[PDB]
Amino acid sequence: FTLGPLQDQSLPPYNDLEDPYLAPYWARREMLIRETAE
Amino acid sequence: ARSLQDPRLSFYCEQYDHIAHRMNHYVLQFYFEDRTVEIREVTKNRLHLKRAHFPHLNRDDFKVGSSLSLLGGVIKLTAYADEVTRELCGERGEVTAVMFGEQLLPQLGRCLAVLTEECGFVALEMQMAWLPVETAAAYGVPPDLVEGRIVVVKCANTNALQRGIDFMARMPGARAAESVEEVGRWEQIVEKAKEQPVAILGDPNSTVVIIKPHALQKLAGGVIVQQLIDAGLEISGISLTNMTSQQANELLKPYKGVLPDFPDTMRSLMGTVWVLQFVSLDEGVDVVSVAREVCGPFDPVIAKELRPTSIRARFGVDRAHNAVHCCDLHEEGPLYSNFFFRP
Amino acid sequence: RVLPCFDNHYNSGVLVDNWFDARINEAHGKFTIAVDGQSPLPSSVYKADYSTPCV
Amino acid sequence: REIVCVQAGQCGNQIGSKFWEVISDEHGVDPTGTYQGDSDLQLERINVYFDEATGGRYVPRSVLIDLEPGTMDSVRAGPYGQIFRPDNFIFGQSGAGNNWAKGHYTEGAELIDSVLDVCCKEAESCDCLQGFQICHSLGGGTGSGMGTLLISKLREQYPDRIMMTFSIIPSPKVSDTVVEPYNTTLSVHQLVENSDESMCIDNEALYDICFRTLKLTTPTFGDLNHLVSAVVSGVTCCLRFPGQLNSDLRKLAVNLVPFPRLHFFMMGFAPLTSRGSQQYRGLSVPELTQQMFDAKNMMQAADPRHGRYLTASALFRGRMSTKEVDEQMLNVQNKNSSYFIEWIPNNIKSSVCDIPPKGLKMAVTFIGNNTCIQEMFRRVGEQFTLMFRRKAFLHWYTGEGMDEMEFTEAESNMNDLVSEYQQYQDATIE
Amino acid sequence: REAICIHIGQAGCQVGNACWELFCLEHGIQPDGAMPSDKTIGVEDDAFNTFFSETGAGKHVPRAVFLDLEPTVVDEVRTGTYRQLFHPEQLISGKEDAANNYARGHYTIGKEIVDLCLDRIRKLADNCTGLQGFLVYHAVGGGTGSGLGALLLERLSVDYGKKSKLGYTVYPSPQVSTAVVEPYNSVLSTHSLLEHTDVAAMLDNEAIYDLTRRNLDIERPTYTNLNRLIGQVVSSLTASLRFDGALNVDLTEFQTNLVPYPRIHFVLTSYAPVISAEKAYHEQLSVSEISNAVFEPASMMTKCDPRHGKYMACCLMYRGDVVPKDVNAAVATIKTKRTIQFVDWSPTGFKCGINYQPPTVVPGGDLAKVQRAVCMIANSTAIAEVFARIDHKFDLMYSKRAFVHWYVGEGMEEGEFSEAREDLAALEKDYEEVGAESADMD
Amino acid sequence: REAICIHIGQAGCQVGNACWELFCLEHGIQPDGAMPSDKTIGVEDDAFNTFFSETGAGKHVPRAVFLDLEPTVVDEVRTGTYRQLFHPEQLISGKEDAANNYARGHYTIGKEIVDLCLDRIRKLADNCTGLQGFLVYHAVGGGTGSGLGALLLERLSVDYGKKSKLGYTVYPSPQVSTAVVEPYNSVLSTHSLLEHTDVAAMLDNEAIYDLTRRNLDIERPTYTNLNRLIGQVVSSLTASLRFDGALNVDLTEFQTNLVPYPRIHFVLTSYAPVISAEKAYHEQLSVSEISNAVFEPASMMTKCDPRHGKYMACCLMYRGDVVPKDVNAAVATIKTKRTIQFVDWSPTGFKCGINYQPPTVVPGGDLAKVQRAVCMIANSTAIAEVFARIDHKFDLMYSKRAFVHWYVGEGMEEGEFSEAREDLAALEKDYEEVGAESADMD
Ligand SMILES: Nc1nc2c(ncn2[C@@H]2O[C@H](COP(=O)(O)OP(=O)(O)OP(=O)(O)O)[C@@H](O)[C@H]2O)c(=O)[nH]1
Ligand SMILES: Nc1nc2c(ncn2[C@@H]2O[C@H](COP(=O)(O)OP(=O)(O)OP(=O)(O)O)[C@@H](O)[C@H]2O)c(=O)[nH]1
Ligand SMILES: Nc1nc2c(ncn2[C@@H]2O[C@H](COP(=O)(O)OP(=O)(O)O)[C@@H](O)[C@H]2O)c(=O)[nH]1
Ligand SMILES: [Mg+2]
Ligand SMILES: [Mg+2]
């Protein structure tokens, strides 16, 4: 249980590829391409 | 050396930014033992100018309520930043105010001479004021001096009040403040006059003369004014302003391509300067011709050889420093007056 | 988390156990959450920000 | 939005005296009752805790109940005691005897009707009534029995309001009374049904706060009750002062309680630091946030590192940025992610209030819903089962009139509360 | 001519304070509702009329309502500096909040207050002669903003019908968060908002914090900065009604140009010359530089990256000293860029507006003074990413019925959760389907 | 920017008192921790930041910990004049001394205290933004300085990694001696210092006594004089971080320029104008005279003669009124001399630094006021003679196991003596091998 140093207390930039809550979205797109072809 | 514990003087300062139209506040430090200056920002504690040497500064220049030229800009010193500079710079910065009446304008040159180079008062505020009767009564001018132009001077020297009383006794006609409240009211008078000065505008028969700072450092301004008055001119207008490099360029643009030392002439007008406007009560006198005849050739060596009694032969040292700048055409009078006196 | 279990016979002045804290506590006095006193409360953010603008 | 306070028994009356001192100080009320404050911000919410009596005076909306008047004479003799309305002191003629059954059944039913008349008189005078606030110990006699009796009656009469309790519970090491397990078990059984929100404090945690953090040489019960009065007065601050993000007791409950039985919370208050050290460290949002999650500053003996946070709430007082709060709560959630229950996407609520407590630039109070609270109840249940198998002191309770079936019911209900917390501790997404 | 502003709850009232501060300072109305004695002379003018009405004694009063369930924020406006500007009837306050419960606002508490709101809006609409829409400011994260905003928009939509309703909405940021129950309230709000709004503009505080860190030099921003930026955006969009220009844009043109299908009405917003006073004098700020600025996602006021989707329509509003030839050259350069892509069914992607009034400078403000600005609102498929994370968070929480007993106890059927979640699933599929390439049909 | 000071045992704490006295007097911080009232102008400068941090009320507090196993010296600091300067948490004290046993400090007693110390150092390092090394002061002759210094350096080296560790170390003098068991503690200490330090500075009390007798006119010197000289040396080395100058030198530059091979990191130190006020007014003090002085064996603070070896690198720090051309002329004159020899693989033997701040004068001090000073640290093979004499005394004592039963009783295997003695033998052989000419090896 550590809060860490002061210099690392800032806002991390948002990266939606590594957002854990959007993985089903990317999986859905990867399925959608083949669904459109068929 | 370049030590950090060396003695210094500290002030709060102001400087107007003509680009952003904003006023900036700094903290100025002057190490008088070796003539170096550092400037820091008050708002965010940011460095503005690293410690650098300036050879044209002196200890006597730094006084409260004064103005300096630094890299072409004007900086105003109105504060004390610590107790040490209050102890060191005190006892030589007491403020007194002197007023002059109508009957003594024809001898104003000798008045300024006795004020500066013999009574020891060094002063940078000097304006001419015309007031209505009710405002003059409210501000507290002497009753006998009402209905006339008055010249107020803000002097500074050791033991200002007693020396001002002595100056009153020495030469008649002048009046001086006898208390602190009188000083404050007369400072209000000079500021209000600065908001809207008095002069004649749109008169083709007029002339404006500027006195260079190096002439003032030699305590020769009063003699120059008296010599100008003696030739047959009547003083109408007086001021003490600090002009920046942009103002000097705007005032001297037509000369671009005439003077062989133009950037050096531009630098010679930085600092405290006096402004004089002269008119004649006789229609048979051309003010520009007599002013230029008195001033003399703009080259001091030629002036010394040919016109030994001229102003520039009397007080000039080089082409860039010729101690006077005066109008040279018959149409420049209104333009110079509009530049130097229109709010 | 444990509790102190030592009996201190001596007074503050003898360098044993909690002399520093004892000296400070006897210097100041009673215990309050407040640190400074006689200071006005600050105004709200809306009152401080939305004032009368300059004309 | 008016709160009515009830203080019961010795602990409750003692904590109440310091609470009403702290509240009267922040609003500048003299012990004579006269307002002497220096800003309008103080006056505009005075109604929240005080009623106005004629020509200046303010009176505090509190009911005092006890079975022997000794404590009441002590509070009446105290420095602020005069402020309290004389008609609000209710007392009997014989003590609780440290027995739950006496306090609940014999002297309880005798006095309780006069307390209900006073509570109704106080409630119906408000233009809009907010929840009740009750302070009592669970280990005592009249506090547990008569407090829970009154709580049950008020829940019958006002079921749509909020019920909030501050409660002192026996230390596992520092017992003050032999029969503590019975009184505690019966009171927890009553509370888990009746209460909406319950806060628990261990005296051992206040001693450890004083010795380790404040380094006090000779602490007294006045210091412990000052810490408690400070935290109690902090939770309501957003009710009664302006701020950038207002908050309310009902909004706290909605964000803190996932399921209706899970309403037992941990408490903390952050700016604690010794008089010698205070010159060495300025207040800032990182320092308060670091102290706020440190278990040293948390007021129960169970430690958070052995459990998981379901939810938490932080109320900030002072002129400060919202960005620093949001990024601090994000950073604590990201770096310690194993200690936060994973099926809730954000566990911390923040709130910001403009007006700090007097003499502090900023402060925060922390309320935490953590599964490590199950360890206290398990300890009480073990000691109860040890005592109950042998009928160790049971004849007192049976002689007052209790049926043995109440003890088995209360034990079963506490065991189910411990089981429910344990199940949510070890839950998984699957 | 006229527009009426509706402010709901805490975010909407606080943003309203900054908006009305700005509109006063730009027109020149004093905080007491009058004008200086020398501002009456000149040419006969009325441009304020879109936002103010005069009684005839020369006081101005604004075409707005402020709605809240808790008193504190409205009592702060009532006791503040602008006390004399607002009509006391305009400041409506209830007794107690909706406690982050959408159900409490919609079913239990808002039903009592809603008829006063409708009577006030009726009293406003009777004193108009060219009403051209409703502007609504609210946050969907809290209980009263969601529940009463939905209920009031439903009633307004029945009574007034076809009149347009444009919303500025503060959505829950993707990793900064303030309350636990945000997903439920945002889903349930969005279900009602789908049927009863014409364009919805989305804002996230995390984006405005990023913008204030990168462009301005502010280490510790607070809500007044964000609200002043929002006020500037609203002033830019409504300037087209109020001042002369080369290419005017009526409020109906946004709705006509931006929305291709009636459900596809959620738009992204960005603003260009966010710059500090010290930086502004070292650089020129030409048309092409700020036009290039509006397309980087670091400039946006919503946390989405448009490079992961395709634009369908853009509306670019220029105010200040701009010449049409520079706008055409800029748009042609943008069109040349390879990282900007339009759906193939929208070949003619742009609408332009050009207004002569430069942006106003506010005495306490942090923006520099600048001669020109551009503001963009645009419709793009990237927005589908915003809904997917809220829907995932709802699914995570709802799998265990984490808080549902509050909603069911305060008056809501359990069925309403499943209906709203299915409607948002269909909205996700709509954004999936619309984004499918029409090419390769043979 | 920042540096953290760790003081261990008696010599290290007493030298710390002189160091912090000097750093306070150079910056102008008063013993209470605040700037003088007649010198607070409103704004100031960052130079203190290397050694002090401000809380915000303007008190200064220093970046140091004082570590001891006996209370007496730290209790003297707690009750002394500087009580208010130090944070009380920084002053850490145990119960009982390590009784001149390295084994007792390392195994028995220091193992309990070390984790509190590491927590304090961690708390310091978190309140920094450009930490660039550790400075450590200790003596290797005593038990706690050797044992706890080694244990703490090992833990620091694991936890912080790449961060630099610079040691100032007082070694046992060649004929002045204070305790019988000094050789054993110094050998076992030196074994740990070899692996876990980047540069090690060597001091001998007999040299500083000789220097204070010969140059200063002091017949009866005491430890306060030596500690003031050490403080001057540390101030000279750290001045490059703190004040403006022509040629700055960052702490990472010392290791790159001074250390040719990773084991060859033990350096000699000297200081030029140690002079009294009465001599100072009879003589000019130009750059070339003090440059010639630092190479004379009469100037060194360690008892070794460099004429018995070859220089590998020199780092020369000039502070005060010096001009680079004079430094170049002086260094060019030194290279000509025949009694100064460099290894043939090091052609560019010198590093220079030039700083404008002249050395400070301490009110009770014995040094004169001078306009310039130079301080030198240099790497030379002559140091091998210092280790050989300690090893000879160790061999004499260990042949009869003169005191070993204490060390074995406090927890140590007899084998550890032979390992350490073999490591010092290998260090001696390294200094023999590195100094061999390539021309003879072809
Ligand atoms: N940008 C911005 N966001 C705000 C502001 N005020 C609140 N918010 C945000 O909006 C959300 C909170 O919504 P509230 O307006 O407080 O909710 P409410 O309308 O009061 O609903 P109740 O709590 O039931 O009364 C949080 O995400 C806040 O960060 C504001 O002034 N500006
Ligand atoms: N120059 C200098 N040398 C000192 C000082 N104090 C002690 N010494 C020398 O260092 C050696 C003694 O080391 P100490 O510091 O006393 O050992 P210690 O760290 O106290 O270890 P313990 O005795 O176990 O507590 C002897 O050679 C002393 O002459 C000092 O203040 N200045
Ligand atoms: N923190 C605190 N605890 C108290 C105080 N007074 C009593 N107690 C504790 O409460 C318990 C005794 O309960 P008590 O109030 O006498 O019960 P009652 O007889 O029913 O009123 C014991 O554990 C006491 O230590 C107080 O002022 N503060
Ligand atoms: Mg609200
Ligand atoms: Mg010792």
JSON list of C-alpha atoms and ligand atoms in Angstrom, two decimals, chain F residues 8-12 14-15 68-70 97-101 138-146 170-173 176-179 182 205 208-209 223-224 226-227 230, ligand 2:
[
{"chain": "F", "resi": 8, "resn": "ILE", "atom": "CA", "xyz": [26.90, 8.49, 10.63]},
{"chain": "F", "resi": 9, "resn": "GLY", "atom": "CA", "xyz": [28.60, 8.17, 14.01]},
{"chain": "F", "resi": 10, "resn": "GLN", "atom": "CA", "xyz": [30.59, 10.67, 16.00]},
{"chain": "F", "resi": 11, "resn": "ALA", "atom": "CA", "xyz": [33.07, 12.12, 13.50]},
{"chain": "F", "resi": 12, "resn": "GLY", "atom": "CA", "xyz": [30.41, 12.32, 10.81]},
{"chain": "F", "resi": 14, "resn": "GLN", "atom": "CA", "xyz": [30.54, 16.55, 14.38]},
{"chain": "F", "resi": 15, "resn": "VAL", "atom": "CA", "xyz": [31.78, 17.33, 10.85]},
{"chain": "F", "resi": 68, "resn": "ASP", "atom": "CA", "xyz": [24.04, 7.47, 15.67]},
{"chain": "F", "resi": 69, "resn": "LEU", "atom": "CA", "xyz": [23.76, 4.49, 18.00]},
{"chain": "F", "resi": 70, "resn": "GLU", "atom": "CA", "xyz": [24.73, 6.46, 21.10]},
{"chain": "F", "resi": 97, "resn": "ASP", "atom": "CA", "xyz": [26.98, 2.06, 21.08]},
{"chain": "F", "resi": 98, "resn": "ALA", "atom": "CA", "xyz": [28.65, -0.53, 18.84]},
{"chain": "F", "resi": 99, "resn": "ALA", "atom": "CA", "xyz": [31.58, -0.64, 21.30]},
{"chain": "F", "resi": 100, "resn": "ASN", "atom": "CA", "xyz": [34.25, -0.44, 18.56]},
{"chain": "F", "resi": 101, "resn": "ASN", "atom": "CA", "xyz": [32.96, -3.73, 17.08]},
{"chain": "F", "resi": 138, "resn": "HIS", "atom": "CA", "xyz": [31.64, 8.63, 8.44]},
{"chain": "F", "resi": 139, "resn": "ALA", "atom": "CA", "xyz": [34.82, 7.25, 9.98]},
{"chain": "F", "resi": 140, "resn": "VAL", "atom": "CA", "xyz": [35.96, 3.68, 9.29]},
{"chain": "F", "resi": 141, "resn": "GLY", "atom": "CA", "xyz": [38.01, 3.40, 12.48]},
{"chain": "F", "resi": 142, "resn": "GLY", "atom": "CA", "xyz": [35.06, 2.99, 14.82]},
{"chain": "F", "resi": 143, "resn": "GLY", "atom": "CA", "xyz": [32.49, 0.26, 15.18]},
{"chain": "F", "resi": 144, "resn": "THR", "atom": "CA", "xyz": [29.19, 1.91, 14.31]},
{"chain": "F", "resi": 145, "resn": "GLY", "atom": "CA", "xyz": [30.66, 4.02, 11.50]},
{"chain": "F", "resi": 146, "resn": "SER", "atom": "CA", "xyz": [32.08, 0.93, 9.80]},
{"chain": "F", "resi": 170, "resn": "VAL", "atom": "CA", "xyz": [38.37, 9.54, 7.92]},
{"chain": "F", "resi": 171, "resn": "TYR", "atom": "CA", "xyz": [40.97, 6.73, 7.85]},
{"chain": "F", "resi": 172, "resn": "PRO", "atom": "CA", "xyz": [43.40, 5.76, 10.65]},
{"chain": "F", "resi": 173, "resn": "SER", "atom": "CA", "xyz": [46.47, 8.00, 10.77]},
{"chain": "F", "resi": 176, "resn": "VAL", "atom": "CA", "xyz": [48.50, 9.07, 15.65]},
{"chain": "F", "resi": 177, "resn": "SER", "atom": "CA", "xyz": [46.03, 6.48, 16.92]},
{"chain": "F", "resi": 178, "resn": "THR", "atom": "CA", "xyz": [43.01, 6.43, 19.21]},
{"chain": "F", "resi": 179, "resn": "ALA", "atom": "CA", "xyz": [42.02, 2.77, 19.67]},
{"chain": "F", "resi": 182, "resn": "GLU", "atom": "CA", "xyz": [41.33, 0.23, 14.43]},
{"chain": "F", "resi": 205, "resn": "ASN", "atom": "CA", "xyz": [43.98, 13.68, 11.15]},
{"chain": "F", "resi": 208, "resn": "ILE", "atom": "CA", "xyz": [45.24, 18.38, 9.05]},
{"chain": "F", "resi": 209, "resn": "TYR", "atom": "CA", "xyz": [47.15, 18.88, 12.32]},
{"chain": "F", "resi": 223, "resn": "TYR", "atom": "CA", "xyz": [38.73, 18.86, 16.18]},
{"chain": "F", "resi": 224, "resn": "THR", "atom": "CA", "xyz": [36.67, 22.02, 15.50]},
{"chain": "F", "resi": 226, "resn": "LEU", "atom": "CA", "xyz": [39.63, 20.13, 11.28]},
{"chain": "F", "resi": 227, "resn": "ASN", "atom": "CA", "xyz": [35.85, 20.10, 10.89]},
{"chain": "F", "resi": 230, "resn": "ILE", "atom": "CA", "xyz": [36.42, 19.76, 5.87]},
{"chain": "G", "resi": 2, "resn": "LIG", "atom": "N1", "xyz": [38.63, 14.83, 12.35]},
{"chain": "G", "resi": 2, "resn": "LIG", "atom": "C1", "xyz": [37.86, 14.31, 13.29]},
{"chain": "G", "resi": 2, "resn": "LIG", "atom": "N2", "xyz": [38.09, 13.02, 13.72]},
{"chain": "G", "resi": 2, "resn": "LIG", "atom": "C2", "xyz": [37.31, 12.46, 14.67]},
{"chain": "G", "resi": 2, "resn": "LIG", "atom": "C3", "xyz": [36.28, 13.19, 15.24]},
{"chain": "G", "resi": 2, "resn": "LIG", "atom": "N3", "xyz": [35.68, 12.41, 16.15]},
{"chain": "G", "resi": 2, "resn": "LIG", "atom": "C4", "xyz": [36.31, 11.21, 16.18]},
{"chain": "G", "resi": 2, "resn": "LIG", "atom": "N4", "xyz": [37.32, 11.23, 15.27]},
{"chain": "G", "resi": 2, "resn": "LIG", "atom": "C5", "xyz": [38.27, 10.14, 14.95]},
{"chain": "G", "resi": 2, "resn": "LIG", "atom": "O1", "xyz": [37.60, 9.00, 14.45]},
{"chain": "G", "resi": 2, "resn": "LIG", "atom": "C6", "xyz": [38.04, 7.83, 15.11]},
{"chain": "G", "resi": 2, "resn": "LIG", "atom": "C7", "xyz": [36.99, 7.38, 16.11]},
{"chain": "G", "resi": 2, "resn": "LIG", "atom": "O2", "xyz": [35.81, 7.05, 15.43]},
{"chain": "G", "resi": 2, "resn": "LIG", "atom": "P1", "xyz": [34.40, 7.34, 16.14]},
{"chain": "G", "resi": 2, "resn": "LIG", "atom": "O3", "xyz": [33.60, 8.32, 15.32]},
{"chain": "G", "resi": 2, "resn": "LIG", "atom": "O4", "xyz": [34.61, 7.85, 17.54]},
{"chain": "G", "resi": 2, "resn": "LIG", "atom": "O5", "xyz": [33.68, 5.92, 16.14]},
{"chain": "G", "resi": 2, "resn": "LIG", "atom": "P2", "xyz": [32.09, 5.86, 16.30]},
{"chain": "G", "resi": 2, "resn": "LIG", "atom": "O6", "xyz": [31.44, 6.23, 15.00]},
{"chain": "G", "resi": 2, "resn": "LIG", "atom": "O7", "xyz": [31.62, 6.75, 17.43]},
{"chain": "G", "resi": 2, "resn": "LIG", "atom": "O8", "xyz": [31.81, 4.31, 16.62]},
{"chain": "G", "resi": 2, "resn": "LIG", "atom": "P3", "xyz": [31.44, 3.82, 18.10]},
{"chain": "G", "resi": 2, "resn": "LIG", "atom": "O9", "xyz": [32.61, 4.06, 19.02]},
{"chain": "G", "resi": 2, "resn": "LIG", "atom": "O10", "xyz": [31.10, 2.35, 18.07]},
{"chain": "G", "resi": 2, "resn": "LIG", "atom": "O11", "xyz": [30.24, 4.60, 18.58]},
{"chain": "G", "resi": 2, "resn": "LIG", "atom": "C8", "xyz": [39.32, 8.22, 15.83]},
{"chain": "G", "resi": 2, "resn": "LIG", "atom": "O12", "xyz": [40.41, 8.10, 14.96]},
{"chain": "G", "resi": 2, "resn": "LIG", "atom": "C9", "xyz": [39.08, 9.68, 16.15]},
{"chain": "G", "resi": 2, "resn": "LIG", "atom": "O13", "xyz": [40.30, 10.37, 16.20]},
{"chain": "G", "resi": 2, "resn": "LIG", "atom": "C10", "xyz": [36.05, 14.49, 14.81]},
{"chain": "G", "resi": 2, "resn": "LIG", "atom": "O14", "xyz": [35.14, 15.14, 15.30]},
{"chain": "G", "resi": 2, "resn": "LIG", "atom": "N5", "xyz": [36.84, 15.05, 13.84]}
]
